[PDB]
Amino acid sequence: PSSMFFEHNEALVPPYNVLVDTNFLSRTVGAKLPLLESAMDCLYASVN
Amino acid sequence: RPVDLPAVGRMRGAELRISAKEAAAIAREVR
Amino acid sequence: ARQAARSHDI
Amino acid sequence: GAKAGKKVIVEPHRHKGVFVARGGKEDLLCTANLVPGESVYGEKRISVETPTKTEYRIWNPFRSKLAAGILGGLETIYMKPGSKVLYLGAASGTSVSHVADIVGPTGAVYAVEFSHRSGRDLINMATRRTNVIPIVEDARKPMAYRMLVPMVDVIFADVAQPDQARIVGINARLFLKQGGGLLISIKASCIDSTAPPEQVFASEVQKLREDKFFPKEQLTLEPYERDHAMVSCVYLQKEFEG
Amino acid sequence: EAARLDSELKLVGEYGLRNKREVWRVLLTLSKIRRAARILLTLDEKDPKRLFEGNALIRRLVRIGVLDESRMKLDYVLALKAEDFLERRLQTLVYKLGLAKSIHHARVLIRQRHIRVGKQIVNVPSFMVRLDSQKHIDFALTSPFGGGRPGRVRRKKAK
Amino acid sequence: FGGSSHAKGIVLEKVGVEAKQPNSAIRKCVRVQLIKNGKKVTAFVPNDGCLNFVDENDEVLLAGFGRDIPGVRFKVVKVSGVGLLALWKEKKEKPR
Amino acid sequence: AAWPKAEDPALVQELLDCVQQASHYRQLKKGANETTKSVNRGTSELVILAADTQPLSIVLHIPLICEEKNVPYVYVPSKVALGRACGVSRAVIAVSLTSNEASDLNSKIRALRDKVERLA
Amino acid sequence: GNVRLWRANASERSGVKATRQRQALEYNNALLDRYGHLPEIRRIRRHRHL
Amino acid sequence: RVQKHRIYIVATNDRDLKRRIRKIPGVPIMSVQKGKYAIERLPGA
RNA sequence: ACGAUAGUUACCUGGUUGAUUCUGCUAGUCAUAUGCUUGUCUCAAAUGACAAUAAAUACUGAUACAGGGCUCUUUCGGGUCUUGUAAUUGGAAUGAGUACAAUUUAAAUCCCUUAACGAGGAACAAUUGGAGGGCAAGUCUGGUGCCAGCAGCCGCGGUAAUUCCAGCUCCAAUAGCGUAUAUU
Structure with a gap:
C-alpha cells in the first residue's frame, strides 16, 4: 500500500484515527477511564 | 468481570464497603 | 538489600 | 526513444477496445481511431495496411x-464498446477523444466542460468525432443538461474540485443506471492539502459510500503521477452490470 | 520493533544525522513539548493561565519558526512533527539553500568551518536556526568559497 | 549460589582432559571449588583455547551461565584476576 | 476575459512574497515559454499571470494549458511588480512556481492555492 | 436507543408486482383463509421461535 | 478495513486479535494496562 | 352495529448432533559486580567514560566495463527496473596534531587572536555484541560399502616462505556497550 516504508507507516499523523474494539471498550470503562482523555494522554496527540 | 462495579471497594448487594485506608487513599490523591 | 549484595561482592 | 516509423505489432488488451502496441524496445497503449488518419493533439498514431x-x-x-490507471492495471473500467459513457471534466477533450475511440461508432460520450476556450477545443473534437457530444456548462448543476444527457452506464470523473464527492453524487443520482459503474480521479492535494493522501483517499471513499456507492477497486496511479488515486466503484448494487 | 527501526532509519536517511542518539534527543524534546501542549488542552478555553501559556508558547514556536505562521492553534502545535524539526536543523537548511551538493557535504562544511550564520562561524550542524536567522547563512570570509586565502590544496599545487 | 553475582573458586582438575571431540562441553568443563563455601562444582569455559590457558589452583571468578550437557549453571569469567576473553583475544597476559 | 483576477487586500502581496521566496529557493520558472514548458511537463505547483501586459493573449493562451493540466492560475495586475518581486531587472508577465517533496514553501503554496481555489 | 423499522405483512415484500406474482400471493392468502385450521398447516403457521 | 486502508490505530485487548493485527505490518496497537493506556507499534511516541 | 354470552380463543415444535470454513500458535532499576573499547570540546560525583554537553574518522565528479540487482502470499512459482566494480582517472575542503609569536595571569596554564606546516588507506590505524555461510594428500567418532556426524590455526614442503574468503556475509549499538545475579 501507498506510504508504506518497510513495516513503517509514514502517513500516521495526529489527528490519529483510532478504531475501538468491544473488549477494549468494555475493560476501559471497567477501569473507569475517560476514554478520550486517556487517549489524548497516551498519545499526546489529537485523536478522532 | 462485571463492568458496573466501582473500584473503590467491594459491593454486597446494594451495600458498598469502603475501608478507612481507601478513603485515606482518596485523601492522598486529593492532595 | 543492595548493601548486603554489595558487601557479598566485597 | 520510440521514434516514428518503427515496425511494431498490436495485440488485444484484456479490456475490450484498448490494444497494446509492442515493438522493439517499446511497449505502449493504443486504441482504434474512428476518424482515420487525423491526429487529435499531435498525438502519435499507428498505421497498418491490412489485406x-x-x-x-x-x-x-x-x-x-485514464491511461495511467490502465497501465497500473485496474480490474475493469466498465466501458465496453457500446456503453454510454458520461465524462466529467472535459479538459479540452484529449482523454475524451481516447474514450470516444473506445466506445466506438455505436457508443456515446456525453462530455462536460465548464471553461469556454477548452470548450472550443472540445466542440472541435466533437465536430470531428460524431460519437461524442459536448456539454459546456457547470458540472455542479446537472439541472443544466438534464434535458441533454440520457441514462448512461459509466461515469468517468476527473474534475479538480473540492466538493467532488457531492458533485458526483448528484450527477450520479440524475444520470446513472442502477448498476452504475464509475471511475473517479483523486488529487489529494486538491481535496485536502494538509492531510496524508491515503487518509484523504479513505475519506473520499467514505463520502462515496455515504452517497450510496460501493467501492470495489482502488489504486495509486503512482509511477505516472504523484498523489493521485483512481477509484473504481459501483452505484447501488454489487456486481457490475445487471 | 521493525516500525521503530524502519522509521528511525528513514529519518537519518532523509536527514543524514549521526545516530539514533541524536534522533532520540529530538524525539525526547518533541515529547516534552507535545506533553505541555496536551496539558494546555487539559485546561479549558478562556482560562487565563491557558491563554497566556498558549500564546507565549506558540509565539516561541513560530519565533524559532518550526510552526507555520499560517496556523496558530494548539491542535496543530500538537500535530507538529520531527520532519519539521529536522527541516529546522541547520545542515538541512544549508542543503535546501544549495550551498552544498548533498546533506553530508553540508555537514562536512559545518564541521570544517566554511558557513556562518550572520556574523559567526558555527561548528555544530545541529544548531537551532530561527526564522529570523534563516536568511544570513553564507560562506565564511576566511572560507576559500567566500574569499581570503585560496586554500591548502590550492597552495600546495600552486607551490 | 549464595546471594552474590559472582564467585571465586579454586581449580581442582580439568576433568575431560582426555577428550576426543574438541568443542564438546565435557572437554570444556572444569571442576572448581568455590572458596567461601568450600564447595566443589563444575563450570564451563566458553572456549577450548581458553581451557588451554586455565591451569589448576588459580583463583577463578565465575558467574551464571544462561541462554550437549544442560545443567551446568556456571561459567568461568576471570582467572587470577584477569579477563579470560582478553586473553582469548590476546589483549593481556596472565599473572602466574 | 481575465475573470480570475486577484483583488487588492494583501492577496497580491502574498503572491509576490511567495514569488520572491520561490526565486530564492530556485523552485520558480519564469517568462512565458518556460512557464509553458513547466506546465507542459506538469511540474508546476501554481502559475501566476500578469494583467497589465501588452495585448493579453499570452496570459490568455497560458490558461488554456492551465485549464488542461488543471493547475491554479491567477491574474496579477502589475508585470513590473512581478519583475521586482522576482529580482530580474526586467518586467515579467508569466511566472510558474513548481512543487518539491520537501519544503515549507510547499505549505505556503498549499495555502495560496487554497485561496485561489476559493477565488475561482 | 434504536428506532427500528419493521415490515408488516411478515413476508409480503414491497414492490410493484407482476400480475401472476400478486395473483399467486392473493391465491395463497385466501387459500390460508380456507385451510388455516388443519393441524399440520396450523402448527407450521403458529410455530414461532421465542 | 485495516488491510484496505492502513491508516488507523487499533485499540483492542484480545491477544489473538493482537496476533492477527501483528501479522500485518504498520499498524499500532492500543491496550489499556489497568493503570493507563499502552501503545505498541507507533514510532512517533 | 354483526359479536367468542363458560377465553379451552389454551396446548399440540425449545431445538441433539455432526461436518466444513475462517482466526490462534518479554522490557526498565540512582542496581551491585565485572569485562571490553576511549581521537576532539565543555562539564564534574570523588585528575575524571561516575555522569552530563556538542561531534571528527572525510565531500564531490568524470570515464570505462559488466548484466543482473532486489523482492516475496502461495516458492521448481510469481512481482519490479538501471545496478554494481579490490575498475581508470580528476577535483576540491582540510581538523586533530605539529606550532613561530602576541595575549591571559602573583608567575604560568586554559580561553580568545595567530604566521607556518598537517589525508591517500599498506593510512593521521572505531569500537562492542549477535547470527551465518565457504575449506584440506589433516584429525576424531558412528555403520549392512561412496553415507553421516561433530569438528577443524595442526596439511606434504616451507618462516623472508607464503600473498590466502585477500580484507566472506548480514543484524544491532556506536565513543559507548556487553555479561552475571537480584529483579521489577
Whole structure:
C-alpha cells in the first residue's frame, strides 16, 4: 500500500484515527477511564 | 468481570464497603 | 538489600 | 526513444477496445481511431495496411490519468464498446477523444466542460468525432443538461474540485443506471492539502459510500503521477452490470 | 520493533544525522513539548493561565519558526512533527539553500568551518536556526568559497 | 549460589582432559571449588583455547551461565584476576 | 476575459512574497515559454499571470494549458511588480512556481492555492 | 436507543408486482383463509421461535 | 478495513486479535494496562 | 352495529448432533559486580567514560566495463527496473596534531587572536555484541560399502616462505556497550 516504508507507516499523523474494539471498550470503562482523555494522554496527540 | 462495579471497594448487594485506608487513599490523591 | 549484595561482592 | 516509423505489432488488451502496441524496445497503449488518419493533439498514431483505412492512436499515460490507471492495471473500467459513457471534466477533450475511440461508432460520450476556450477545443473534437457530444456548462448543476444527457452506464470523473464527492453524487443520482459503474480521479492535494493522501483517499471513499456507492477497486496511479488515486466503484448494487 | 527501526532509519536517511542518539534527543524534546501542549488542552478555553501559556508558547514556536505562521492553534502545535524539526536543523537548511551538493557535504562544511550564520562561524550542524536567522547563512570570509586565502590544496599545487 | 553475582573458586582438575571431540562441553568443563563455601562444582569455559590457558589452583571468578550437557549453571569469567576473553583475544597476559 | 483576477487586500502581496521566496529557493520558472514548458511537463505547483501586459493573449493562451493540466492560475495586475518581486531587472508577465517533496514553501503554496481555489 | 423499522405483512415484500406474482400471493392468502385450521398447516403457521 | 486502508490505530485487548493485527505490518496497537493506556507499534511516541 | 354470552380463543415444535470454513500458535532499576573499547570540546560525583554537553574518522565528479540487482502470499512459482566494480582517472575542503609569536595571569596554564606546516588507506590505524555461510594428500567418532556426524590455526614442503574468503556475509549499538545475579 501507498506510504508504506518497510513495516513503517509514514502517513500516521495526529489527528490519529483510532478504531475501538468491544473488549477494549468494555475493560476501559471497567477501569473507569475517560476514554478520550486517556487517549489524548497516551498519545499526546489529537485523536478522532 | 462485571463492568458496573466501582473500584473503590467491594459491593454486597446494594451495600458498598469502603475501608478507612481507601478513603485515606482518596485523601492522598486529593492532595 | 543492595548493601548486603554489595558487601557479598566485597 | 520510440521514434516514428518503427515496425511494431498490436495485440488485444484484456479490456475490450484498448490494444497494446509492442515493438522493439517499446511497449505502449493504443486504441482504434474512428476518424482515420487525423491526429487529435499531435498525438502519435499507428498505421497498418491490412489485406489502408485502419489506424490506431497511442495514448500518453502522463497526459491522461485514464491511461495511467490502465497501465497500473485496474480490474475493469466498465466501458465496453457500446456503453454510454458520461465524462466529467472535459479538459479540452484529449482523454475524451481516447474514450470516444473506445466506445466506438455505436457508443456515446456525453462530455462536460465548464471553461469556454477548452470548450472550443472540445466542440472541435466533437465536430470531428460524431460519437461524442459536448456539454459546456457547470458540472455542479446537472439541472443544466438534464434535458441533454440520457441514462448512461459509466461515469468517468476527473474534475479538480473540492466538493467532488457531492458533485458526483448528484450527477450520479440524475444520470446513472442502477448498476452504475464509475471511475473517479483523486488529487489529494486538491481535496485536502494538509492531510496524508491515503487518509484523504479513505475519506473520499467514505463520502462515496455515504452517497450510496460501493467501492470495489482502488489504486495509486503512482509511477505516472504523484498523489493521485483512481477509484473504481459501483452505484447501488454489487456486481457490475445487471 | 521493525516500525521503530524502519522509521528511525528513514529519518537519518532523509536527514543524514549521526545516530539514533541524536534522533532520540529530538524525539525526547518533541515529547516534552507535545506533553505541555496536551496539558494546555487539559485546561479549558478562556482560562487565563491557558491563554497566556498558549500564546507565549506558540509565539516561541513560530519565533524559532518550526510552526507555520499560517496556523496558530494548539491542535496543530500538537500535530507538529520531527520532519519539521529536522527541516529546522541547520545542515538541512544549508542543503535546501544549495550551498552544498548533498546533506553530508553540508555537514562536512559545518564541521570544517566554511558557513556562518550572520556574523559567526558555527561548528555544530545541529544548531537551532530561527526564522529570523534563516536568511544570513553564507560562506565564511576566511572560507576559500567566500574569499581570503585560496586554500591548502590550492597552495600546495600552486607551490 | 549464595546471594552474590559472582564467585571465586579454586581449580581442582580439568576433568575431560582426555577428550576426543574438541568443542564438546565435557572437554570444556572444569571442576572448581568455590572458596567461601568450600564447595566443589563444575563450570564451563566458553572456549577450548581458553581451557588451554586455565591451569589448576588459580583463583577463578565465575558467574551464571544462561541462554550437549544442560545443567551446568556456571561459567568461568576471570582467572587470577584477569579477563579470560582478553586473553582469548590476546589483549593481556596472565599473572602466574 | 481575465475573470480570475486577484483583488487588492494583501492577496497580491502574498503572491509576490511567495514569488520572491520561490526565486530564492530556485523552485520558480519564469517568462512565458518556460512557464509553458513547466506546465507542459506538469511540474508546476501554481502559475501566476500578469494583467497589465501588452495585448493579453499570452496570459490568455497560458490558461488554456492551465485549464488542461488543471493547475491554479491567477491574474496579477502589475508585470513590473512581478519583475521586482522576482529580482530580474526586467518586467515579467508569466511566472510558474513548481512543487518539491520537501519544503515549507510547499505549505505556503498549499495555502495560496487554497485561496485561489476559493477565488475561482 | 434504536428506532427500528419493521415490515408488516411478515413476508409480503414491497414492490410493484407482476400480475401472476400478486395473483399467486392473493391465491395463497385466501387459500390460508380456507385451510388455516388443519393441524399440520396450523402448527407450521403458529410455530414461532421465542 | 485495516488491510484496505492502513491508516488507523487499533485499540483492542484480545491477544489473538493482537496476533492477527501483528501479522500485518504498520499498524499500532492500543491496550489499556489497568493503570493507563499502552501503545505498541507507533514510532512517533 | 354483526359479536367468542363458560377465553379451552389454551396446548399440540425449545431445538441433539455432526461436518466444513475462517482466526490462534518479554522490557526498565540512582542496581551491585565485572569485562571490553576511549581521537576532539565543555562539564564534574570523588585528575575524571561516575555522569552530563556538542561531534571528527572525510565531500564531490568524470570515464570505462559488466548484466543482473532486489523482492516475496502461495516458492521448481510469481512481482519490479538501471545496478554494481579490490575498475581508470580528476577535483576540491582540510581538523586533530605539529606550532613561530602576541595575549591571559602573583608567575604560568586554559580561553580568545595567530604566521607556518598537517589525508591517500599498506593510512593521521572505531569500537562492542549477535547470527551465518565457504575449506584440506589433516584429525576424531558412528555403520549392512561412496553415507553421516561433530569438528577443524595442526596439511606434504616451507618462516623472508607464503600473498590466502585477500580484507566472506548480514543484524544491532556506536565513543559507548556487553555479561552475571537480584529483579521489577
